[PDB]
Enzyme design. Structure first.
Site, PDB file in Angstrom:
ATOM      1  N   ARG A   1      36.018  58.771  79.083  1.00  0.00           N
ATOM      2  CA  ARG A   1      34.819  58.745  78.290  1.00  0.00           C
ATOM      3  C   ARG A   1      34.623  57.289  77.884  1.00  0.00           C
ATOM      4  O   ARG A   1      35.593  56.532  77.795  1.00  0.00           O
ATOM      5  CB  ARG A   1      34.907  59.637  77.053  1.00  0.00           C
ATOM      6  CG  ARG A   1      35.075  61.117  77.372  1.00  0.00           C
ATOM      7  CD  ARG A   1      35.237  61.952  76.109  1.00  0.00           C
ATOM      8  NE  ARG A   1      35.404  63.371  76.419  1.00  0.00           N
ATOM      9  CZ  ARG A   1      36.555  63.934  76.784  1.00  0.00           C
ATOM     10  NH1 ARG A   1      37.657  63.202  76.875  1.00  0.00           N
ATOM     11  NH2 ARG A   1      36.609  65.232  77.051  1.00  0.00           N
TER      12      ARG A   1
ATOM     13  N   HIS B   1      28.135  59.186  80.934  1.00  0.00           N
ATOM     14  CA  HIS B   1      28.836  60.284  81.615  1.00  0.00           C
ATOM     15  C   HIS B   1      28.762  60.225  83.153  1.00  0.00           C
ATOM     16  O   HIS B   1      29.434  60.998  83.841  1.00  0.00           O
ATOM     17  CB  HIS B   1      28.283  61.593  81.109  1.00  0.00           C
ATOM     18  CG  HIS B   1      29.171  62.802  81.453  1.00  0.00           C
ATOM     19  ND1 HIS B   1      30.492  62.902  81.060  1.00  0.00           N
ATOM     20  CD2 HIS B   1      28.901  63.932  82.148  1.00  0.00           C
ATOM     21  CE1 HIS B   1      30.997  64.039  81.504  1.00  0.00           C
ATOM     22  NE2 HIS B   1      30.054  64.682  82.169  1.00  0.00           N
TER      23      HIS B   1
ATOM     24  N   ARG C   1      31.936  59.672  85.411  1.00  0.00           N
ATOM     25  CA  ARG C   1      32.718  60.886  85.267  1.00  0.00           C
ATOM     26  C   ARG C   1      32.289  62.004  86.223  1.00  0.00           C
ATOM     27  O   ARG C   1      33.138  62.574  86.911  1.00  0.00           O
ATOM     28  CB  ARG C   1      32.715  61.356  83.810  1.00  0.00           C
ATOM     29  CG  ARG C   1      34.034  61.091  83.134  1.00  0.00           C
ATOM     30  CD  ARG C   1      33.910  60.689  81.685  1.00  0.00           C
ATOM     31  NE  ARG C   1      33.759  61.832  80.790  1.00  0.00           N
ATOM     32  CZ  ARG C   1      34.703  62.729  80.513  1.00  0.00           C
ATOM     33  NH1 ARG C   1      35.901  62.668  81.077  1.00  0.00           N
ATOM     34  NH2 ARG C   1      34.433  63.709  79.671  1.00  0.00           N
TER      35      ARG C   1
END
Lengths: 322, 322, 322, 322
Positions: C154, C270, C273
Site C-alpha cells: 500500500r 492501488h 497492486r
DNA sequence: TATAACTTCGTATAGCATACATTATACGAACTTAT
DNA sequence: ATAAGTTCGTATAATGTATGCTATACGAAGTTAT
DNA sequence: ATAACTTCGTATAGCATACATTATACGAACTTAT
DNA sequence: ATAAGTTCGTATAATGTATGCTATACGAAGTTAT
C-alpha cells in the site's frame, strides 16, 4: 437432575449422530471408571474431581499410554458436558493432573508410535510378486493395496466403497466417490482417482469376483478357501480383515513378527496412508496437493505423517557428506 | 476467597503440570508486578484492569520488548485463570493498551531478534582452525558443535544425551536415539543420524573422555583445567556451558564482543538450528523436509530464518527477472 | 450514563490502538450524522434505530455509494458498541434497510469500482520512457513505481519505509522490512524483496537524494523545483503526492484526464497492486505464492483483485478462436 | 409478545431487504411447517426444538435431500431470528438430528447432483446441425447457447441483457456490459467479451429479429409459431424458456428423456457454465482464471465440476504413472 | 471330518481440526571446586 | 590465582497444549461354507 | 511568482472472519396470436 | 386446434452477506524553498 436424565436421553435417541466407535469407547471407559469406583467407594456419576484425579493417577500407575489416559478423561468429559453438567476437566484437580501425567510420561520417555510405512517401493515389489497370480484372494488383496496407496483412504472408508460409487475419467481411469470420512460428511463428497495401473488391478478384481452383478454390492468382500468370492450388499469386509491383508503381505516378504509384543512391527491399516504421504514429501509435492490427496484441511497434519522420515537419508546427512 | 485458596493449593499439589521454567517466570513476573504495585499503592491480587494497564505502560517506557510485555500479561492471566478469577486480558483497558503498545513499538522500529547463524562455512572454518588440537576441551567442543549442526537438537536435548542412546548403522554412522522427545507426538522423529565426519568427531571425544565406561553416562561432561574429563550419570553439563562453547568459539575467531549489551553478537544455543535451516534452503530442500529436520510445526519460525535468501524472494522477483 | 462516558474516555485514552483513518472517519461520519440530526430534530447520541433508518435513506437519496452508506452505519455501530450500548444494526429497522439499500442500488446498476491496472507492460513502457531522465524527481518516481509494482505494498506502507529498513540478500537484491500493514502488526514483520532491475532503480534514487546520510530518514521525500531532494526522519512524503506520481505518469502517456468527475480515469495508489496481481494470475502463479506476494492470509481477495481481467484476451475467447 | 409483532412489521416495511426468491421459499417452508404442525397438534410459532426435530425426521422420511432439509431449517432460523426469538438450530435436539440425518442419508447413498455439462464438443455439434437453419427460432436458440457458453452468465443474467449493453471492441468482437451485477463486488467483472464466431451468431439473431430497433429492448424475446419475434423493452424471456432451449436442444440430438423422474437428464440453465469450466480445465487454464471466468469465489463449486477430469486427478496418480 | 478365512470384541492407542499459552533459550553476574 | 564450570534472575524467542471427537491395533474367541 | 508539494474533508474501496440467503429445475397449469 | 410461451410451487444447487475495522480517491486550499 431431570435436565440431566433428559439430556442423556436425547443423546441416546440420536445416537447415530455420533460414531459407533465413540459409543464403543464411552462404554469401555465407563466400565473401567465404574469398576474402579465400586472398588474404591466412590460415586461414578456425577464424577467428583478428586475421584477422577485419583483414577487418572491409577491409570498412569497401570502404565497406560498418555493418549489412552486422555481418552478415559475425554469420555468422562463428554458424558458430563452433554448431560449439561460441568466436566471433570473444568476443575484444577483434573486438568492439572492430566498436564502432570503427560509431562511425567514424556519425561520418562514416552512418545506416540506410528504405523510402519507402506511406500511405493514396497508396492511395486508386492505387485511384481503377486500380479501373475490367478488366485482370487491375491487379485483382491492386490486391488486393495493399490487403492489404499493411491487414495490414502482409511480402511473403514475402503470397506464402505460400493460398486455404484465407481465412475471413469475420459482417459478411462477409475474414480471412487467417498461420501463419508472421519472429518467430512457430505452429499457432494470427494472423488478419489486411481492411476491406470491401479485401475487395471481393480478391474481384474471386479471381473473375477462378480461384484458388479449388483451396483449396491460393496467393492470388497470375503473370499472363501475354495477361491470363490462372496459379494454382499449388506455385509462389509471387516476392518480387521483389511488389517490382516496388510499383515499377511508383510509376512509374505519379511516373515514372522518380532517377539517384542510392540505395535507396528508389520504393516497395518494406516501404513499406506503414511507411506504415500512420505513419498509425496520426498518427491517435492507441494503442500496444497498433499492435503488434496489426503483430504486434509489443515497443514499441521502433514508434520504428523512425515515425522519419522529416515534421518540417515535425511537432508542433513546428505548435505554434510557433500 | 476459600475458593481461590483451594485453587492455589491444587496448583501447588500438581506443580509438575508445568515446566520449572514456567514457574520461574511466573515468580519473576509476580515479583516485578508486586513491587510495582507496592510502589504505586495498588492491590496486586486480584489484579485490577486499570492497574495492569498502568503496569504495562511502565513496561513499555522501560524499553522491554513487545514479547516480554505479552509474557508478563500471559503470566498474570494464567495465575488468575487457575485461581478462578477474571483474566486481566479480558478487560477493555488492557486489550486497548496492548494494541497501542504493539503498534507504537513497531512504528518506533523495534525488531524481533534471533540467533546469529552458525552455518556450514562456520562449521568448516571451526573444524579447520581446531582439528590439530589434542586438548580434551577442544575435542569435546568440536563434537558438540558437530552434533548441534547435524541434528538441529536444542541445547537441553543435547545435554540429556546419554551414551546408551548411541548405536551404529550398517553404514558405520552414529545414530542418536532421542530419549526424551520434545512432545508426545515427536515431529522431529525418534532418531538423529550423524554423518561420517561428525561420527568421527564424537568417536574421538568418546575415547579421550572415557564416558563410555558407563552407558548411563551423559555424552557430554565438564572438563577441568588440567584437561581431565569428569563423566557423570547423574549430573548434566549445564545449558549455560553449552552456550559458553558457542560463544567462546566466536570469540576465538572474531574476538571479544561489544560492551553494548545487545543480544546475539556472538553465536548461541540456537545458532546451529538457524544455520542448518538456511543451508537446507540453499540446497533446495523443501520446506516440509526442513521442518521435519528441526522438528518445526510452525512454518513462520523457519521462514524467519530463511527469508533473506535469494531462493525465498517470491514470484514477483521471478516475473520481473524473466 | 457514567459507564458510557468511562467506556468512551478509555477508547480515547488509547486512541493509538486504532488507525488515524478510523478516527478521521468516525469524526467525519459524526459531523454528518449530527448535522442531519440538528436539521431533522433528532438526538444524535445515543442513536435511536428509527432516526438511523431515516438517515441511511437520506444518504441513499443523495446518490452515495453503498460502501459509503456502509461506512456511515459502521462508524455509528462502533461508537455505540465501544460505549457499551446496543448498535443501531442490532435492530431490524437499521439492518434490514441497509440490506435493502444495498440490494436496491445493485439492482439499479451499482457495482464497487476498482483502480485502473498498472501492469508489467505499463511499467516497461514507463521505464523505457523515463530511464534516461537525470531529473531527480523522475529518478524518485521510477524507484517508487518499481517498489509499488514489485512489492504490492500500500502507498502508506511505502511512505513509511525508512532507510534502516533496507538490507541485502547475498545476491545483492534489496530487501525491505515492513513491520506494519493494514492487517499485520508485528516486531518480526515481513521482508519484501526487489528484483535486480528494481534494486538498481532504488539505488540510483538513494545516490541522488542523499537519504542514506541518516538511517532514520524515510526512503522517499519531496523534490523541490531546483531538482534537490529534502530528506527527513520526521516528515513523510504524503500518500497524496504518491498518488500524484501515478496520476502524472498516466498523463504523460495518455494526456490529461477526462472532466466527467468519475473515479479511476487514471492510475492511482492501488493500481500497481491490482496490476501485479493480474500479471501473477495470468502467468499461472500458484494461489499460495500470490498470497505470499501480497501478504494475504485468506484466499478470497485474490478474486477481488483479478475480478476485472480483460475479457477479450480472457480464457474463453482464446479457447473459442483457437 | 408485542416486540415480536413489531419486528415482523419491520420485516414487511423493508421486504426488499431480501430477494423475492427468498420470500417465495420462506412462505413455502412456512406452509409445509404449519401444515405439519396443524396435523400433528403442535404450535407452529414460536417453533419448539422437539417439534422441529420431529418435522425434520418427517422431511427425511419423505425422501427429501439433505440440502432441502437444511433449506427448511434455515428458513425457520431466519423467521425466528428476525422475530427476535431463539433459533431452532441453537437447540440440542435439532443439532443432533441434523448430524444424524446427514450421516444416514450419505450412508444410504444420497448424492448431490449437478447440471449435465454442455461442452465445446456439444456446441460444435449443435452448430454443425443448426448453423444454416434459417428458421428464426433456431437462430435465437443458437445465439443463446453461444452467449451461455462464451460468457458463463447465468440464465437470469442472460435474460436481462439489453441491446444497449452491447458494443464493439477494437478487434471487431461484441462486448456485453453487465447492466446488473450479481453482487456489489462483481467477481465476474463488468464486461463479457464474445469470440468472433459467437459474435456472428448473435449478429444473425439481432438482424433477423429486429431487437436493435430500440436500444432498450432485451436481447432475447418470444418467437411465435410463425417465426416472428416480438421484441420487448418491458418483459423478458422467462428463465423457464431459456431452460427449455437447453432441454429442446438435448432432445434434438438424444430424443425424449430417461423419464426416471431424475434431474439433469437433459441440458439445463447451468449446463454451459459447468461445460465451459470443464473445457478450461482441459486446456490447462489456471484455477484462479477459471474462477474469474464464472464469477466463482468458492473453489469447491468449480472442483465439483472438473474433479473427474484426467488433468485434475491429483499428485498420487501423477507419481504412480512415471 | 478339520479347516481357511473370516467375524466380533475387548482394551489399548493414534489422527484431526480448531482454539489458544506455556516453555525454552540468552546472558551477565555471583558462586564454587578442583587445580 | 584461576580454569571452567554451576546457579540464578530476568529478558525475550520459541513453540507448545486442550478439546471433542473419530479412528486404527491386535490378540483372542467364535463362525460358516466347504 | 512558482514548482511541487502538504493538509483536509468527504466519498468509497480492501480485508479477515463467521455465518444465510438466493439462485436454478421442472412438471403443470395457464395464456395468446396465429 | 396449437406452438410457444408465461406463471407457479416446491425441490435442491449455488453462492451469497455482515462485521469491524483500515485503507485509498481526489478536488481544493494552503505552504515554502527557490
Amino acid at each position: 437432575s431431570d435436565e440431566v436424565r433428559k439430556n442423556l436421553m436425547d443423546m441416546f435417541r440420536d445416537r447415530q449422530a455420533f460414531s459407533e466407535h465413540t459409543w464403543k469407547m464411552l462404554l469401555s471407559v465407563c466400565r473401567s471408571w465404574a469398576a474402579w469406583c465400586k472398588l474404591n467407594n466412590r460415586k461414578w456419576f456425577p464424577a467428583e474431581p478428586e475421584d477422577v484425579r485419583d483414577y487418572l493417577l491409577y491409570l498412569q500407575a497401570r502404565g497406560l499410554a498418555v493418549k489412552t489416559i486422555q481418552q478415559h478423561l475425554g469420555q468422562l468429559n463428554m458424558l458430563h458436558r452433554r448431560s449439561g453438567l460441568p466436566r471433570p476437566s473444568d476443575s484444577n484437580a483434573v486438568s492439572l493432573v492430566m498436564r502432570r501425567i503427560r509431562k511425567e510420561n514424556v519425561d520418562a520417555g514416552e512418545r506416540a508410535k506410528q504405523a510402519l510405512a507402506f511406500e511405493r517401493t514396497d508396492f511395486d515389489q508386492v505387485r511384481s510378486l503377486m500380479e501373475n497370480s490367478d488366485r482370487c484372494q491375491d487379485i483382491r488383496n492386490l486391488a486393495f493395496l493399490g487403492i489404499a496407496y493411491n487414495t490414502l483412504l482409511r480402511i473403514a472408508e475402503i470397506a464402505r466403497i460400493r460398486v455404484k460409487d465407481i465412475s471413469r475419467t475420459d482417459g478411462g481411469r477409475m474414480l471412487i466417490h467417498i461420501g463419508r470420512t472421519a472429518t467430512l460428511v457430505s452429499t457432494a463428497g470427494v472423488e478419489k482417482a486411481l492411476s491406470l495401473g491401479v485401475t487395471k488391478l481393480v478391474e481384474r478384481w471386479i471381473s473375477v469376483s462378480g461384484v458388479a452383478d449388483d451396483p449396491n454390492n460393496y467393492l470388497f468382500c470375503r473370499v472363501r478357501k475354495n477361491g470363490v468370492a462372496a459379494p454382499s450388499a449388506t455385509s462389509q469386509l471387516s476392518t480387521r480383515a483389511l488389517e490382516g491383508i496388510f499383515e499377511a503381505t508383510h509376512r509374505l516378504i519379511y516373515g514372522a513378527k518380532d517377539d517384542s509384543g510392540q505395535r507396528y512391527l508389520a504393516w497395518s491399516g494406516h501404513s499406506a496412508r503414511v507411506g504415500a504421504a512420505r513419498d509425496m514429501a520426498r518427491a517435492g509435492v507441494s503442500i496444497p496437493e498433499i492435503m488434496q490427496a489426503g483430504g486434509w484441511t489443515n497443514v499441521n497434519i502433514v508434520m504428523n505423517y512425515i515425522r519419522n522420515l529416515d534421518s540417515e537419508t535425511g537432508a542433513m546427512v546428505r548435505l554434510l557428506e557433500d
